[PDB]
């Protein structure tokens, strides 16, 4: 997951730097970079946090309002990258080709999320090169239920800015 692009996510809990795998996840990387470059992720939150599993964000505001994303992309989970601790992957629904803006960072080795004979899996497209301790921190913030959502941080963890680094 070192395709080339580096992205810095500055959150209210600290900074996380990512290196995206443009070679193995071209579509996922272009989709992600397009969102960051457009300023889409600014003011979105990590709305789903589960210790020992992952932290997911990039879709809702602090008031749990969902931002209208761009059209869904094809699933690249069969690119051979695994959902090991420290990787970034695309969140999606039942349809394997339903990913849009939401992504999650694995804070544990989640092999059950990998492309396999039982399910297409979740597309990994990068890795955290800096800030894993921050991701761990975010994963353990107190949470509660908001609407149909569970594991929502009681105190929103906001992505104040997302930028492609030089």
Overall description:
It is a single chain. The protein is mainly β. Helices cover 12% and strands 32% of the residues. The chain has a single domain (1-166), classed as Cyclophilin (Beta Barrel), CATH 2.40.100. A nine-stranded antiparallel sheet has the order 3-11-1-2-8-6-7-5-4. It has a two-stranded antiparallel sheet with strand order 9-10.
Keywords:
two-stranded antiparallel sheet; signal; 12% helix; mainly beta; globular; Cyclophilin; 2 helices; 166 residues; 9-stranded antiparallel beta sheet
Class by SSE composition: mainly beta
Describe the sheet with the most strands: 9 strands, antiparallel
Helix count equals 2
Order of helices and strands: EEHEEEEEEHEEE
The helicity comes to 10-25%
Strand tally is 11
Could you give the distance between the termini? 18 Å
Provide the CATH architecture.
Beta Barrel
- State the CATH class: Mainly Beta
**What multimeric state do the chains show?**
monomer
**Shape call:** globular
CATH T-level fold name: Cyclophilin
Beta-strand content bin: 25-35%
Under CATH, the homologous superfamily reads Cyclophilin-like
The domain count comes to: 1
> Taking Cα atoms only, what radius of gyration do you get, to the nearest Å?
14 Å
The neighbouring-strand order within the major sheet is 3-11-1-2-8-6-7-5-4
EC number: 5.2.1.8
Subcellular location: Periplasm
Family: Belongs to the cyclophilin-type PPIase family.
GO molecular function: peptidyl-prolyl cis-trans isomerase activity
């Amino acid at each position: 997951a070192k395709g080339d692009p580096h992205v810095l996510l500055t959150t209210s809990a600290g900074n996380i730097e990512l290196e995206l795998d443009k070679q193995k996840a071209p579509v996922s990387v272009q989709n992600f970079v397009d969102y960051v470059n457009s300023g889409f992720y600014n003011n979105t939150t990590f709305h789903r946090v589960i210790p020992g599993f992952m932290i997911q964000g990039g879709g809702f505001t602090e008031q749990m309002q969902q931002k209208k994303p761009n059209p869904p992309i094809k699933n690249e989970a069969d690119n051979g990258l695994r959902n090991t601790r420290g990787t970034i992957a695309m969140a999606r629904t039942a349809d394997k080709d339903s990913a849009t803006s939401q992504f999650f960072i694995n804070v544990a080795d989640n092999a059950f999320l990998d492309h396999g004979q039982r399910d297409f899996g979740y597309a990994v497209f990068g890795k955290v090169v800096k800030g894993m301790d921050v991701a761990d921190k975010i994963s353990q913030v107190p949470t509660h239920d908001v609407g149909p959502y569970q594991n929502v941080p009681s105190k929103p963890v906001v992505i104040l800015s997302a930028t492609v680094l030089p």
